[PDB]
Design a protein around this ligand. Structure first.
Ligand SMILES: *[C@@H]1O[C@H](CO[C@@H]2O[C@@H](C)[C@@H](O)[C@@H](O)[C@@H]2O)[C@@H](O[C@@H]2O[C@H](CO)[C@@H](O[C@@H]3O[C@H](CO[C@H]4O[C@H](CO)[C@@H](O)[C@H](O)[C@@H]4O)[C@@H](O)[C@H](O[C@H]4O[C@H](CO)[C@@H](O)[C@H](O)[C@@H]4O)[C@@H]3O)[C@H](O)[C@H]2NC(C)=O)[C@H](O)[C@H]1NC(C)=O
Ligand SMILES: *[C@@H]1O[C@H](CO[C@@H]2O[C@@H](C)[C@@H](O)[C@@H](O)[C@@H]2O)[C@@H](O[C@@H]2O[C@H](CO)[C@@H](O)[C@H](O)[C@H]2NC(C)=O)[C@H](O)[C@H]1NC(C)=O
Ligand code: AR6
Ligand SMILES: *[C@@H]1O[C@H](CO[C@@H]2O[C@@H](C)[C@@H](O)[C@@H](O)[C@@H]2O)[C@@H](O)[C@H](O)[C@H]1NC(C)=O
Ligand SMILES: *[C@@H]1O[C@H](CO[C@@H]2O[C@@H](C)[C@@H](O)[C@@H](O)[C@@H]2O)[C@@H](O)[C@H](O)[C@H]1NC(C)=O
Ligand code: NAG
Ligand code: NAG
Ligand code: NCA
Lengths: 209, 209
């Protein structure tokens, strides 16, 4: 029953979408790549991902971007995408990430938003275009890091957006990822460092005793 | 087996008194030998190494009051919410909207839920929350949908039990059974959470334009 487009969108699911480049769904980079990961661990993070929810491409862009036409840009949630409390204030706190913690991210290293290693794509409230590849060394723009020196981030729940439920945890950094790497706070992990279950467990948090 | 770190052989169950062969080392605190083979539970447990890199007795020594059968798991402070730099829990009161899907490992007399599909390692649960108590709910696993909006404590999950945590937890003010009896939640059949589209979000509105 799973498919690129909801069944309602056929026979012409790309109607209203201006074709630009055939790498992307309907030719539109905002709709993300046609090709998705078929191997662990990335396929595990995408197993619950219905890219448009129950919407069709033009409906999705009409809802979440300023225009269905190519000049339209995605609109992002207020308060940095933190889930809002009953007083419409973001839920978050400053928190120290411990040495050893593993983080990952879909996007360039000029960004400031990470998630705990292995968070489902739908928990991140990201649009489909964060899966576009810009560097062949990092398919799907997917990066994994490990904390090598303690540092403080804004930490809190992710608000739903982009037709997904959110409710992962996001870490919002004060320095971009590249600067954290170059300053010795993060190191990059290669696939052999995150392709076994034990690499997802936690050896750094001490026990109560 | 692969239940155990290779370093734990021979006698990976050293120090563990055998009780019942449903469970690892015969110990219900260590969870079931047989893990789920179907979506979504297999997706939720694909990154779960139940002992981390510890051997069974080491795991219980770290996280329970006793390796002997009478030892009980020790739980994190502040109801398991991640702590900020001032050592206060990060959380807020939040309204769960009609349509949101939630899940839970545990009986309906409890009060802790997660967004549908959260990886087991994001929940900072001990292995015994996977034990089956009712044949109608293999692995203790329950799925719900909000039918009337209500307020919960909402916040990030601290690491515990050798896992990274950092999902979002919802701590309810009434137990789950009362929420069902009062019309706030309904129970979902497996048919209602075995398709990718059923994990997407149709209830959150798009930005005002
Ligand atoms: C989230 O919302 C919570 C309330 O939400 C509602 O209620 C829940 C149960 C659901 O139904 C939900 O759907 C509703 O929306 C909110 O809970 C509130 O938390 C505060 C702070 O913890 C509580 O205040 C404390 O109250 C106790 C009890 O006071 C009564 O008895 C004492 C007897 O000593 C009398 O003196 C009072 O007049 C009351 O009759 C107080 O003992 C306590 O005082 C102590 O702490 C304060 C701190 O300010 C000091 O000033 C004092 O000197 C004491 O040291 C607090 O005043 C409040 O009762 C509680 N409300 C309810 C309805 O339970 C929670 O704080 C929200 N959380 C967040 C993160 O926003
Ligand atoms: C979280 O902390 C920031 C301040 O963090 C410091 O500055 C950052 C740039 C980063 O380097 C951190 O590691 C530092 O510890 C708070 O922002 C400050 O808030 C105070 C209070 O009003 C204000 O006077 C300062 O000007 C702010 N400083 C900056 C740089 O913005 C922020 O409010 C904290 N958030 C929470 C939720 O506690
Ligand atoms: N190598 C690249 N070359 C050119 N453009 C790129 C490249 N990589 C990404 N883009 C484009 O850069 C943009 C994404 O930047 P990014 O750093 O990757 O990922 P984000 O999710 O953190 O940034 C989105 C933020 O923007 C909102 O306001 C919120 O603050 C969001 O957090 C896309 O248009 C890409 O086409
Ligand atoms: C964005 O562009 C709109 C026109 O786009 C053009 O016309 C439509 C019918 C498609 O054929 C599309 O491929 C073309 O590029 C404008 O009407 C609209 O005002 C523009 N938005 C802004 C903010 O300038
Ligand atoms: C907890 O249990 C400890 C060991 O109990 C012994 O081993 C188990 C397997 C049973 O056979 C039991 O009958 C044995 O006595 C005790 O040493 C300890 O006192 C108990 N209580 C506490 C609080 O630790
Ligand atoms: C545009 O399409 C061409 C194929 O004609 C492809 O080689 C190129 O990489 C595409 N551009 C992007 C940014 O993907
Ligand atoms: C082990 O536990 C299961 C479930 O509680 C039960 O069905 C089974 O009978 C138990 N085995 C023994 C030998 O008690
Ligand atoms: N780019 C990401 O992977 C991301 C975005 C928002 C929150 N957490 C992680």
């Amino acid at each position: 029953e799973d498919s690129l487009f909801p069944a309602r969108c056929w026979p012409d699911p790309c109607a209203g979408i201006t074709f630009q480049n055939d790498t992307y769904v309907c030719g539109d980079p905002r709709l993300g790549p046609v090709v998705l990961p078929q191997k662990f661990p990335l396929n595990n993070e995408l197993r619950t991902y219905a890219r448009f929810g129950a919407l069709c491409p033009a409906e999705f862009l009409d809802k979440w971007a300023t225009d269905v036409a190519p000049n339209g840009t995605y609109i992002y949630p207020p308060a940095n995408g933190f889930a809002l409390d009953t007083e419409e204030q973001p839920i978050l706190g400053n928190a120290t990430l411990p040495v050893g913690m593993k983080l990952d991210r879909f996007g360039s290293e000029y960004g400031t938003f990470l998630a705990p290693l292995g968070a489902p794509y739908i928990e991140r409230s990201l649009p489909p275009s964060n899966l576009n590849t810009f560097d062949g060394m990092y398919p799907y723009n997917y990066h994994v890091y490990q904390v090598t020196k303690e540092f403080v981030v804004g930490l809190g729940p992710i608000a739903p957006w982009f037709e997904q439920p959110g409710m992962g945890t996001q870490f919002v950094t004060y320095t971009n990822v590249l600067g954290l790497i170059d300053d010795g706070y993060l190191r990059r992990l290669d696939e052999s460092e995150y392709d076994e279950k034990v690499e997802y467990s936690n050896p750094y948090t001490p026990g109560p005793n």
